[PDB]
Structure 1
Amino acid sequence: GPLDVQVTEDAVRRYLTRKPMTTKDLLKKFQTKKTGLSSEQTVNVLAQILKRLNPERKMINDKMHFSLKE
């Protein structure tokens, strides 16, 4: 299937638009086993993305979740 799992702002935005997610929830969507990225590279690019998006922060189950869900 031309044109897989890559850490992009587009992907993060789509996940956060669907539902609030913690940092751990998001990291689970971009597993190193699929990207081949080291844990450090993964944390670094996700940080840049989350910084730019600056998602709303909601407390759910006593835990801060990022959210672009209105």
Structure 2
Amino acid sequence: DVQVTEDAVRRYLTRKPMTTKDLLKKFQTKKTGLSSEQTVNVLAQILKRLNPERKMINDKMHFSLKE
């Protein structure tokens, strides 16, 4: 019984900066039996509206949030 919510995604960014690839990997195909497109579509609609900030960490782009 696993569900995806905006609060859950933001929680990770609020605690530690992460990348889109890392976020998707969390529920890419671990347990949730959701289609690859569906998984991205759900997080995309939520993340896309997130309009967060980008930071250069280890020569890479990461997502960070400051409530």
TM-score (norm 1): 0.81
- Give structure 1 regions of 4+ aligned residues with deviation exceeding 3 angstroms: none
Checking the alignment, whether the CA contact within 8 Å between 1:7 and 1:42 is kept in structure 2 is no
Question: Which range moves more in the overlay, 12-21 or 27-36?
Answer: 27-36
**1:4-57 CA distances to partner (integer Å, 9 max, x unpaired)?**
432210110111111110111111221323111011101111111111111111
Count of matched residue pairs: 67
TM-score (norm 2): 0.84
SS in 2 for 1:36: coil
Name the Cα RMSD after superposition: 1.5
Gaps of 5+ in 2: none
Checking the alignment, whether the CA contact within 8 Å between 1:17 and 1:67 is kept in structure 2 is yes
Q: CA deviation at 1:69?
A: 4.2
Q: Distance in 1 between matches of 2:58 and 2:13?
A: 17
Checking the alignment, whether the CA contact within 8 Å between 1:22 and 1:64 is kept in structure 2 is yes
